[PDB]
């Protein structure tokens, strides 16, 4: 059953028959018609390239019309199994759109959790608009001397409904929605604003070197990065706040590498302009081993998930050792994440990790408390 | 946040621009056209049903007017939201939408080709399977020190009567992401196990008992066929059917299998408890494996072709290979280097610590007959 030839005047199937399979026309033409009492009623003619017999398969109902070959035709068979396989695995509302169209095309030619997702997106975007969002900052520290060298910017939603939704999942929603670009724009702006403030205070207390080497880490999502005008907008924002590129560090996940072409150059643009590129959640998600060989990275983060089990089992300790040494060999530098105890800080230090981040040192805090932290 | 509209209120009129769609929560509405003075009722829509969607998808005007027949409450659905969901839908599913839309419009008033080609190709492939056009070739895996054959990888081949001996990349993806995995996968495992028994029998009959006892048959098991239930059950009867020991059978997955997690982890442990060797193929290419080495009981891990072919070319990918090999040893995992074409690369991999090898240098994959000759 590949393609099949049928001759002129042959009824392929009749209306009211059971729906076995669909057909795509390769050669010739066919007629779609209804019959009422004695009169036959032509709905349309279908020439090559067009498809028919599909309706019956999707919703498991009978043939809504008859079909007859107006000339010699050649048809390519499409199976019931094939269409169901594709519709069943489709988006939830997309499947509704299909059912209404089917039912309307039939009815006329004769004559919650999906909704909840929509409502939640609106709740989040409305929350954004009423100024319920805020950035906190977590110190990144030099493990040797315990000195603060920078900070990661982290988003916060000040509402009791955030706990009802999920700590992570409101970011997932944001990231997969197209409210990414206006919110992302606000984040970058806010972080850059507070960076200027952090630097200004440091200089006014005769800490010129610490101010010159300070890093502001910003978490940039996949959609907002691969969007055009990203570097353009990012640059006028840096200009607006009078900042240098070496103090701004962009933090992506590995997943950004699966795209390829559209990403490569944007990484290289940021790299040529002087922005530091950091890879977060490394070894968790999309594999970058061979993509770390060719692309230009500055830092790479050993994720919480590894660090918390570093003393627990020796398997994940081996992996951390490996990551750290590999990073050095690649000329990449490392920030260990999720350090909660002095013991794990020591191990990471003897393994060769230079920089640290975790509750041991400091949980993320507001700008006020952060400015106080950098006076000791 | 839904909106109430009173009786007789026109929501929108035909010919208006398409802002957004609506889902009816309470009440009923009428869909109608107007000609000159007379209005023509297409249908009535009650609660649960959706309207105003057509205009948004293909960016055309309102195809009909809508008026509330009673007090109704409507839930708003945005333009952005529908486009976001349809654009990210399956390729043929999007065709099915366009034909239905066009037919519902064209009759109410009265990326195409490569989508169809996918359907035709699946049928071509499955039909080819059914007329016995598939065959397994085997590629020697060799001990790098002594150059002795220690096992083989089973690789699928399509020897079409018109296309000829075509190679698996053009049709394995299709097979793997289709309902035809389970019957074809079953045939592969059976065929490989059948020919394993043969390989062992011939070895013993030539007084090579030790080589027969240590022989490995590598089988490439896809993600869908692994995560399917009855996998270990079917695998086990098949081993019993051919009178084979588990230590001679090695299952070869890609990293992707563990994006699932729970459903996989135990099936790995079942195979591991039963005595099957688990090998990870295409490591560092696809879904990140670093954290997968912490969780899984792995026996072997393959350094992919992609690394090996550039191992002399640039020193960056040589560092990565060194790292992988040492990490593997530290995890108590053993290594098979893949895609060795020159003696020089074989030497480097040997000094780096890789024990086993696979590549054209030694032998390309061949039929069972030629393989049985190779092992003398
Ligand atoms: N248990 C433990 N956790 C520690 C410790 N130290 C830091 N953490 C947590 O580690 C997370 C930062 O890592 P991430 O991979 O950027 O993980 C972030 C990041 O993926 C995303 N995110 C946060 N802010 C932004 C943002 O502004 N833009 C985007 N696109 N994503 C953001 O949300 C994720 C979670 O953010 P948070 O809940 O703030 O969680 C933070 C922080 O609270 C520790 O010592 N112990
Ligand atoms: N150029 C070059 N190539 C070398 C060399 N040494 C080995 N190869 C190639 O490496 C491929 C096997 O690696 P794979 O990652 O399992 O790659 C396989 C595997 O992912 C998939 N595949 C093949 N057979 C099966 C199967 O029976 N079941 C499943 N699930 N997948 C299969 O198809 C992929 C390609 O298979 P093949 O075309 O047979 O290609 C083979 C083999 O021809 C070399 O020295 N030079
Ligand atoms: N109004 C129409 N205009 C064009 N084709 C139609 C129309 N109605 C039905 N068809 C096609 O005719 C086929 C009859 O069999 P099905 O109902 O399975 O699938 C139907 C559609 O593919
Ligand atoms: N024939 C029909 N049967 C039921 N609803 C229809 C029909 N034609 C159009 N509609 C609906 O009326 C809406 C008018 O605006 P749209 O064309 O955007 O989307 C249209 C459909 O949602
Ligand atoms: Ca981060
Ligand atoms: Ca992280
Ligand atoms: Ca393989
Ligand atoms: Ca491989």
Residue numbers in the entry:
A (entry chain A): 5 to 115, 138 to 402
B (entry chain B): 6 to 115, 136 to 401
Please give sentences taken from the publication describing this entry.
Our observation of a classical open/productive EAL dimer for Bd1971 led us to investigate competency for c‐di‐GMP binding at the active site. Crystals of Bd1971 (grown using cAMP ligand) were soaked in solutions supplemented with c‐di‐GMP and Ca2+ (included to prevent substrate turnover). Clear electron density was observed for c‐di‐GMP at both dimer active sites, bound in the expected extended conformation (determined to 2.83 Å resolution, structure in Fig 3E). In comparison with our multiple structures with an empty EAL active site, there are no gross changes upon binding substrate; this is distinct from MorA, whose H‐helix (mapping to the Bd1971 interdomain linker helix) and associated GGDEF domain undergo a 20˚ rotation when c‐di‐GMP binds (Phippen et al, 2014). Smaller, local changes upon binding are limited to the metal‐binding pocket (which like other EAL domains, binds one metal in the empty state and two metals in the substrate complex), and residues which undergo rotameric changes to accommodate c‐di‐GMP (Arg330 shifts to relieve a clash with the nucleotide base and ribose, Arg182 and Tyr385 move inward to interact with base and phosphate, respectively). Structure of the cyclic‐di‐GMP bound complex of Bd1971 (ligand C represented in yellow, bound Ca2+ ions as green spheres). Residues R182, R330, and Y385 display the largest shift between the apoenzyme (tan) and bound (blue) states, R182 complexing the cyclic‐di‐GMP phosphate, and Y385 stacking with a guanine base. The configuration of the active site residues of Bd1971 is similar to other (active) EAL structures, further indicating that this form represents the active state of the Bd1971 EAL domain; hence, we instigated further study into how the novel domain structure (with a stimulus‐sensing cNMP domain) could switch EAL activation states.
Herein, we provide high‐resolution structures for an EAL enzyme Bd1971, from the predatory bacterium Bdellovibrio bacteriovorus, which is controlled by a second signaling nucleotide, cAMP. The Bd1971 domain architecture is predicted to consist of an N‐terminal cNMP sensory domain (cyclic nucleotide monophosphate, postulated to bind cAMP or cGMP), a middle linker region, and C‐terminal catalytic EAL barrel. We reveal that regulation of c‐di‐GMP hydrolysis arises from a domain‐swapping of the “regular” cNMP fold, which undergoes significant rearrangements upon binding of stimulus, communicating a series of conformational changes over 40 Å to license a productive state at the EAL dimer interface. C‐di‐GMP turnover was increased ~8‐fold in the presence of cAMP or cGMP, further supporting the proposal that cNMPs are activators of Bd1971.
